[PDB]
Curated annotation (Swiss-Prot):
Record-level GO BP terms: proteolysis
GO molecular function: aspartic-type endopeptidase activity
Name of the protein in its database record: Endothiapepsin
Organism: Cryphonectria parasitica
EC number: 3.4.23.22
Domain of life the protein comes from: Eukaryota
Shown chain mapped onto the complete sequence: 90 to 419 of 419
Top-level taxonomy: Eukaryota, Fungi, Dikarya, Ascomycota, Pezizomycotina
Length: 330
């Protein structure tokens, strides 16, 4: 089997992306944030504290003839930024782009932090990291991809995120019309539960390529590109007036600037992020200070190839017995 679903940015600046997912019988369609950096499928629901729901579409398990309580199971997750959610668990039928999994753990939120409440366009998350990170207790649950894997034509999914435009998540096949040239595959470590790999270096604009190993994760769930402070300083040094500011907690550049591209290495291949992709717009309405899309990872503990980087490529998440990642230009 295969599936194919369109993923759509939530606003004009690609702050996050949403993909429609069918849950239950009859289907209840919720727009979920597909997140290769986490491993829980959780939704706003009829159980969510009412004051913490503000415009989201909710899953109501009592209206699904295929829903079943997973007795005794609870979940709780903290993301790196202070965003949190928790609740109980049902199993139900879940379909993405025509690919159906029965008995999928659907984690129903009883509580969500304010950032989730305020994101009216995001009805939940669908995790696509490794199932070892799933937070359900006392019985850890599998991701949608792990449950679908054996049925798929090939044990892969692909992320093709758009710049200021919709893109595609495919399951079970590689669309050879969706990229140019060849896909370069690179080794993955699953030791931390992430799609963790090692970039071979970087270049700033038309500058020379610096060969250096950069370990990081491919995370569709992270909006920005987070890299070592040395690399980030070298990038922003090429933008007149750019600076790291403590009020905004990161690098800002003049909204009159033209940004240089940023290239990252995948083996001997190179992925070029156009300068415009590194532009996230004014820090507040009417400001002439604009938010940079490349930021330091120094406070995180890991480098993160988030959407800024991934949207410049066609990305293969290869879930074979020994997982690998593939990147192609497009
Ligand atoms: C899921 C998610 C991410 C996101 N990232 C961008 C962002 C903007 C401002 C401050 N911090 C982050 N914006 C939203 N709306 N939801
Ligand atoms: C995948 C994901 C979503 C999310 N949503 C909360 C949120 C909303 C707005 C701005 N920043 C965060 N937070 C995180 N860390 N990961
Ligand atoms: C995405 C974005 C928005 C922006 N807004 C500033 C602005 C205000 C008024 C007229 N022209 C520009 N400036 C830049 N560099 N990128
Ligand atoms: C205007 C704005 C602020 C912001 N703040 C959160 C933040 C600070 C430092 C690094 N990463 C995230 N994030 C985004 N995307 N836009």
């Amino acid at each position: 089997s295969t599936g194919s679903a369109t993923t759509t940015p939530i606003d004009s600046l690609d702050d996050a992306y949403i993909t429609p997912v069918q849950i239950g019988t009859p289907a209840q369609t919720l727009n979920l944030d597909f997140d290769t950096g986490s491993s829980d499928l959780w939704v706003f629901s009829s159980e969510t504290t009412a004051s913490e729901v503000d415009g989201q579409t909710i899953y109501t398990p009592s209206k699904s003839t295929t829903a079943k309580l997973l007795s005794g199971a609870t979940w709780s997750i903290s993301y790196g930024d202070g965003s949190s959610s928790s609740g109980d668990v049902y199993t139900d039928t879940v379909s993405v782009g025509g690919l159906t999994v029965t008995g999928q753990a659907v984690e129903s939120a009883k509580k969500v932090s304010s950032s989730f409440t305020e994101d009216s366009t995001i009805d939940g998350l669908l995790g696509l990291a490794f199932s070892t990170l799933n937070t359900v207790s006392p019985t850890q649950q599998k991701t949608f991809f792990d449950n679908a894997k054996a049925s798929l034509d090939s044990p892969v999914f692909t992320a093709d995120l758009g710049y200021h435009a919709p893109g595609t998540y495919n399951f079970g096949f590689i669309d050879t019309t969706a990229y140019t040239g060849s896909i370069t595959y690179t080794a993955v470590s699953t030791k931390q539960g992430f799609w963790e790999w090692t970039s071979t270096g970087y270049a700033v604009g038309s500058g020379t390529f610096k060969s250096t190993s950069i370990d990081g994760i491919a995370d569709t769930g992270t909006t920005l590109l987070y890299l070592p402070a040395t690399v980030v300083s070298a990038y922003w040094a090429q933008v007149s007036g750019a600076k790291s500011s403590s009020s905004v907690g990161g690098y800002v550049f003049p909204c009159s600037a033209t940004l240089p591209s940023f290239t990252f290495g995948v083996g001997s291949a190179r992925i070029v992020i156009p300068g415009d992709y590194i532009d996230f717009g004014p820090i507040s309405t009417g400001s002439s200070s604009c938010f940079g899309g490349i930021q330091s990872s120094a406070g995180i503990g890991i480098n993160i190839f988030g959407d800024v980087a991934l949207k410049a490529a066609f990305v293969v998440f290869n879930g074979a017995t020994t997982p690998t990642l593939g990147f192609a230009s497009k």
